[PDB]
From TrEMBL:
It comes from Morganella morganii. Its EC number is 3.5.2.6. It is an enzyme of class 3 (hydrolase). GO terms for molecular function: beta-lactamase activity. It catalyses: a beta-lactam + H2O = a substituted beta-amino acid. Disulfide bonds join 52-98. NCBIfam families: bla_class_A, blaTEM. Residues 25-238 form the Beta-lactamase class A catalytic domain. It comes from the Bacteria. The keyword Hydrolase applies. Pfam families: Beta-lactamase2. GO terms for biological process: beta-lactam antibiotic catabolic process; response to antibiotic. This is Beta-lactamase.
């Protein structure tokens, strides 16, 4: 809907930054709306969903097992590790690490998962192998959040991310059980409360993952729709603002409310 493009255009205005937007029908693949679809933006935390796709892909091939326990130490803890910090003696299963990376955005968990696949280079090879020759991870947590203008490391485009997430969720790459697990973690997300979630009426599905980094960066990827009805994929990134966190949050909710209202 043009009124959703209008809200996205208002958002550039109010944030003083570029916003990239994609609304994609999930079942059919038809792109319903786009805006700056081929511009690069920092992936920030939205990458952790790709990362767990790679892992679930290794599970399917028998190169990984979700029940395997990983032991780590105090010195692997990096800022913002709500779950990993509580299991120094205990360790975590790979399944517990995905859940933490997805639902809590645990940075240590993502680093541990990246070690299991053999690093950010391998994530990019995974992506490149599934048809996305655009998106790349180059660094580990916390440095992948830098967000230097014009730097292509740790970036994606609204169009590449939207279609990649489309293939992960419903394409021919993962098993039915892996597709289902991915969606389940994304539905349990706890850190995107003030974004698209807050626009959603009762009786709606949503499975999402948000991100934030330096230089005013904000983003969310989502699948969502009325329960039992054809879902859409939505991908919003903005970078370059000096605006507050809460005002970045409020522009994404206002975009969400237009999309929902004009569904």
């Amino acid at each position: 809907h043009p009124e959703t493009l209008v809200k996205v255009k208002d958002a550039e205005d109010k944030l003083g930054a570029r916003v990239g937007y994609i609304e994609l029908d999930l079942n059919s693949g038809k792109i319903l709306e786009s805006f700056r679809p081929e511009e690069r933006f920092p992936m920030m935390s939205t990458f952790k969903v790709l990362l767990c796709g790679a892992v679930l892909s290794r599970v399917d091939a028998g190169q990984e097992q979700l029940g395997r326990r990983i032991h780590y130490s105090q010195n692997d803890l990096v800022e913002y590790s709500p779950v990993t910090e509580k299991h120094l003696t205990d360790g975590m299963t790979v399944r517990e690490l995905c859940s933490a990376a997805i639902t809590m955005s645990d940075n240590t968990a993502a680093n541990l998962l990246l070690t299991t696949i053999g690093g950010p280079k391998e994530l990019t090879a995974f992506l490149h192998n599934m048809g996305d020759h655009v998106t790349r991870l180059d660094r580990w947590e916390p440095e992948l959040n830098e967000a230097i203008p014009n730097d292509e490391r740790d970036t994606t485009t609204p169009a590449a991310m939207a279609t990649t997430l489309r293939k992960l969720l419903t394409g021919e790459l993962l098993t039915l059980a892996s597709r289902q697990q991915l969606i389940d973690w994304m539905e349990a997300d706890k850190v995107a409360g003030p974004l698209l979630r807050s626009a959603l009426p009762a009786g709606w599905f949503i499975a999402d993952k948000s991100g934030a980094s330096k230089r005013g960066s904000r983003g969310i990827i989502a699948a969502l729709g009325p329960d039992g009805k054809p879902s859409r994929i939505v991908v919003i990134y903005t970078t370059g603002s000096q605006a507050t966190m809460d005002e970045r949050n409020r522009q994404i909710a206002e975009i969400g409310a237009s999309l929902i209202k004009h569904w």
